[PDB]
Every structure is written in structure tokens, then in C-alpha cells.
Nucleic acid binder design. Structure first.
Ligand SMILES: Nc1ncnc2c1ncn2[C@@H]1O[C@H](CSCC[C@H](N)C(=O)O)[C@@H](O)[C@H]1O
Ligand SMILES: [Zn+2]
Ligand SMILES: [Zn+2]
Ligand SMILES: [Zn+2]
Ligand SMILES: [Zn+2]
Lengths: 7, 472
DNA sequence: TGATGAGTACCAT
DNA sequence: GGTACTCATCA
């Protein structure tokens, strides 16, 4: 379910 | 790309601007947000449209008049009647302008009569905005009233949106787009206060979803131990043969850390007393880049996604009410786990969830990835993962979707080791009651191998219009 | 429960 | 150019 991310 | 996603994106942008204006403590931050959108030329439908707007389905729930402005659905934050002015005359040369395109019924005019498929809508004008909110002079056949008259005369339909009062923790009012109506006829008469009003009889058009009006299959009174501040019931309406999701699974509210997983050094924290408010003094704010990532609204809302959020922790001088402890607070919403048709267990909410609100940390047993099924969340902001296979909180019951209403946010609070960050699910959108909560798992296509080289695959069933059809 | 609120729509004391 | 108009929103 790993991914993400928004600096 | 697809219109529903464009709408979603526009609404997320508006939410971001709104929360920034709330943080900046401006007046009417809802209206300021719209002003920002206009400045940025980010209004999705900047010109008026007769009929349906792509990506805004009948039944669409808006959480403010401002949101409607931000998408271009209804372009006044106050006016009940939105219409094409004479500027549109050349574009619609076969019609007489002005022409109405959208009205809002919010129960503010004493002569309005709402009968669902049939409505008697009062024209604008001569209405007290405040006080008794009654008619205080005569109306005239101009502006929106003239526009609705032309709609009647040309068979041009009008979008109709209803305000609804909400008994909700955080949302006072909601506006539902209820579909297209024709103006069947109109006339002038004395209203109940004795002044002339124009009245517009509207009839809902055919070809649309039915206007909708507004404990069973219970398997478990509460999947949590009584551990969650708000109980989480579970239902299977899909199967007789009703085992409960808790079987083989034990509910915990706190991470369990395996022996071979290392516990990083504790963070130092800030020295604020009570609550952290000033970005100058507070070191945790400094960690966030000189500003607080959460705004103090509806018990705390994340303004926007980041690589990592730095929350106050065990050594901070602040108490638990600190807004920079937003994701540490107790479950705010009444939720339900339910058996889906073919995704197995799913989670939905019984109340409104504002965008930016925390839903839950992904809790389970933190294991080394090397030492390891379906309930493993890898931590990447990968050496470490959260295994909710046998024990965890409710987070593990939340399904994947290709068009999610939640997103994953990495949070550090007790330490500074990004490898072991807290994984927290936040609402990406304003969520209505009974909507399934989902996030994008983000498995890349053809990720798992048997491997004879043989690609092991999983079919996706989020039902989303742009599904890509595969979990992996 | 008052007082703002801001973008137009159309007029041009 | 100017300003009456306006079915919100919140303390
Ligand atoms: N969009 C989807 N379509 C089909 N199956 C899904 C799905 N999202 C999640 N699942 C199923 O749920 C697992 C993720 S764990 C999510 C909870 C699960 N529904 C349960 O019953 O416990 C996956 O292995 C997959 O089998
Ligand atoms: Zn703090
Ligand atoms: Zn602080
Ligand atoms: Zn702190
Ligand atoms: Zn899908």
C-alpha cells in the first residue's frame, strides 16, 4: 500500500 | 483529465486556498479563497453554461456557496439567481438575453414553496438580507427575474441547488445540485407580506436520477475493544454466513515494535506552554519550514500534503490540545466497517469529513521488510513496514481506489527517522456520509512475480470511471 | 442574532 | 468610472 508524497 | 477528476482537483485547490486564508485569519476566508482562485485563473468553468457541467453529477454535494463559485457552477456567493448577462448576447443570438442558468433555494424567501419535483421559486429583489428576512418592497421584472422569464419563453433549463441544514460536528450547511428544471410559467402577485413578488413555477426535467429523500446486518457492535473514542460497528449485508472482521485479528491503538526493529533516538521537541501558536518560538514549526502545517479549525485540519509533517511529541512542553498534535487526537468520526460485494471489508463514514481532517494512523506491528500478505504497509517518505495482518487499528480495513478520497501523509513526532515515520490517512476531499473511504495503494503495474517470470496479478474493483483495472 | 462581504451588471446624478 | 444589488457566513 506503499506510495505517497507531496513535497 | 476526465471531468470528475478535474472537478475534484479544482475543489482541492479551493480547499487549500481556504485553509490558508483561515490560517492567515482573514475575514470570510471562504470568499478570500475564491478571490485567490480568480486571481490564479483557476475557476474550472469561467464562462456560463446552460445545462449540466461535465463532472458535476446530479446529487453533487457542495459544502459552501464559495465552492460553487470556485468551480464556476454558481458565480455569486450571495445571489440566488445566476444568469448570462447581455455580454453573452452575440454568442446566443437565437435567444433573448439575459438567461438564467442556475438558482439556489435556501429557504430565505418567505414566498418560496418547495415540493421536490415541483417548486415555486420567488424572484430576487425587495428582500431583507438580514433581520426578519421578509419582503420590504415590490419586485421588478429585471435581472434574474427577467432571466428566468426568458428561460420560460425559450424552454431553457435551469440548474437547481438546495441548501440543507446539517446536524454535524463540523458542517453547518450543505448544498446539493438537484438537477435541471424548466420554468413552466411565471407571474406577478402580492406575496405574503403584501408587496409584489414574481413567482416562477419550475418542474424537474425527465431523464435524470430520481430526487432522493432524507441495526441491519450487524455482525459486531464495535470492532475496536471499546478502545476507540467512538465505536466502530461492523455489518455484513452481503452474506448470511456472517463472521466478523475481528476473527483472527486483535485491535490495538498503538504500534507494536518487533525485537529486530530499532527504536530511533527521541526528538528534542519544543518548549511552548499549553499550545503551540507562534512560529518564531516553536522549534517544531521551524522543523516544518517556519510554519504550522495544521490550522485550528474543526479540531485541526492539514492545510496541504507534504513530504513529511513534524508534529509535537513526547518531550514538547505543550499539552495534548496543541494543534500541532492534530493526528494524535482521538477518532473524531462515527465510522462503519461493512462487507463489500467483492473487495471484502470496507470502511465508510456516518458523518461529514472535512478535507484535511485526519482519519487515522495506520497501526499494526512494525517489522523489518526483509523478515516478511494483504495488510502490509511499507514505510517510504524500504527497510520497514507496518504489518496489520493479525493486529492493528481500523486502518487496515480501508480499501484501494483509483480515485481516492483519502491520502497518505508521513508524520514524525516521537523521532526524526523518516524510515520509521508514522503513516497517517487524511481526507483529501470533503466526504459525505455513507461514502466509502479509500486511498490509492499505488502498486506499479506488473509488480509481483512468482516468479517463473510469471506476473502475479490482482484485479481492481474500485468501480472508478478510470480504473486501470489492476491493483498490480 | 448584525455587519460585513466582493464581484458583477448595467447605468452613466 | 460608479454603485445598487445581493436565497451567506461568522463571531
Ligand atoms: N479496489 C479493490 N478491488 C478488489 N479488491 C480490493 C480492492 N481494494 C482492496 N481489495 C482487497 O483487499 C485487500 C486490501 S486490505 C483491505 C481490506 C479488505 N477489503 C479486507 O477484507 O480485509 C487486497 O488484498 C484486495 O484483495
Ligand atoms: Zn505543540
Ligand atoms: Zn511548540
Ligand atoms: Zn513541539
Ligand atoms: Zn480501480
Amino acid at each position: 500500500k506503499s506510495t505517497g508524497g507531496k513535497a | 483529465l476526465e471531468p470528475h477528476l478535474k472537478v475534484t482537483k479544482c475543489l482541492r485547490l479551493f480547499n487549500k486556498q481556504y485553509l490558508l486564508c483561515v490560517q492567515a485569519k482573514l475575514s470570510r476566508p471562504d470568499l478570500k479563497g475564491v478571490t485567490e482562485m480568480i486571481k490564479a485563473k483557476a475557476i474550472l468553468y469561467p464562462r456560463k453554461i446552460i445545462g449540466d457541467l461535465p463532472g458535476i453529477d446530479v446529487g453533487h454535494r457542495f459544502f459552501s456557496r464559495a465552492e460553487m463559485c470556485a468551480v464556476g457552477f454558481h458565480n455569486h456567493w450571495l445571489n440566488g439567481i445566476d444568469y448570462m448577462s447581455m455580454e453573452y448576447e452575440k454568442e446566443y443570438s437565437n435567444y433573448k438575453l439575459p438567461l438564467a442558468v442556475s438558482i439556489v433555494m435556501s429557504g430565505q424567501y418567505e414566498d418560496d414553496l418547495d415540493n421536490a419535483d415541483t417548486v415555486t421559486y420567488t424572484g430576487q429583489g425587495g428582500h431583507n438580507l438580514t433581520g426578519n428576512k421578509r419582503q420590504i418592497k415590490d419586485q421588478l421584472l429585471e435581472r434574474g427575474n427577467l432571466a428566468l422569464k426568458h428561460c420560460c419563453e425559450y424552454n431553457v433549463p435551469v440548474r437547481v441547488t438546495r441548501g440543507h441544514n446539517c446536524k454535524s460536528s463540523y458542517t453547518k450547511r450543505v448544498y446539493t445540485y438537484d438537477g435541471l428544471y424548466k420554468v413552466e410559467k411565471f407571474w406577478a402577485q402580492k406575496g405574503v407580506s403584501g408587496f409584489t413578488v414574481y413567482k416562477y413555477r419550475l418542474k424537474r426535467l425527465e431523464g435524470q436520477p430520481e430526487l432522493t429523500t432524507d441495526i441491519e446486518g450487524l455482525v459486531c457492535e464495535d470492532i475496536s475493544g471499546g478502545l476507540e473514542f467512538k465505536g466502530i460497528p461492523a455489518t455484513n449485508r452481503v452474506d448470511d454466513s456472517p463472521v466478523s472482521p475481528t476473527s483472527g485479528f486483535t485491535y490495538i491503538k498503538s504500534l507494536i515494535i518487533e525485537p529486530n526493529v530499532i527504536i530511533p533516538k527521541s526528538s528534542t521537541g519544543c518548549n511552548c506552554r499549553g499550545s503551540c501558536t507562534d512560529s518564531k518560538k516553536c522549534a517544531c514549526a521551524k522543523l516544518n519550514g517556519g510554519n504550522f502545517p495544521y490550522v485550528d479549525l474543526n479540531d485541526g485540519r492539514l492545510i496541504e500534503s507534504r513530504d513529511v509533517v513534524f508534529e509535537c511529541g513526547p518531550h514538547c512542553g505543550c499539552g495534548p490540545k496543541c494543534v500541532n498534535r492534530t493526528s494524535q487526537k482521538r477518532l473524531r468520526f462515527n465510522l462503519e466497517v461493512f462487507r463489500s460485494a467483492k473487495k471484502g471489508w470496507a470502511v465508510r463514514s456516518w458523518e461529514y469529513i472535512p478535507a484535511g481532517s485526519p482519519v487515522c494512523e495506520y497501526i499494526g506491528v512494525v517489522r523489518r521488510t526483509a523478515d516478511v500478505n494483504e495488510y502490509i504497509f511499507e514505510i517510504d517518505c524500504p527497510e520497514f513496514c507496518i504489518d496489520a495482518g493479525s493486529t492493528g487499528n481500523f486502518a487496515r480495513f480501508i480499501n484501494h481506489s483509483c480515485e481516492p478520497n483519502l491520502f497518505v501523509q508521513c508524520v514524525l513526532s516521537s523521532h526524526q527517522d523518516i524510515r520509521l515515520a508514522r503513516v497517517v490517512l487524511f481526507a483529501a476531499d470533503n466526504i459525505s456520509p455513507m461514502q466509502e473511504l479509500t486511498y490509492d495503494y499505488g502498486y506499479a503495474l506488473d509488480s509481483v512475480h512468482g516468479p517463473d517470470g510469471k506476473v502475479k496479478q490482482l484485479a481492481c474493483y474500485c468501480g472508478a470511471l478510470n480504473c486501470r483495472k489492476r491493483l498490480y
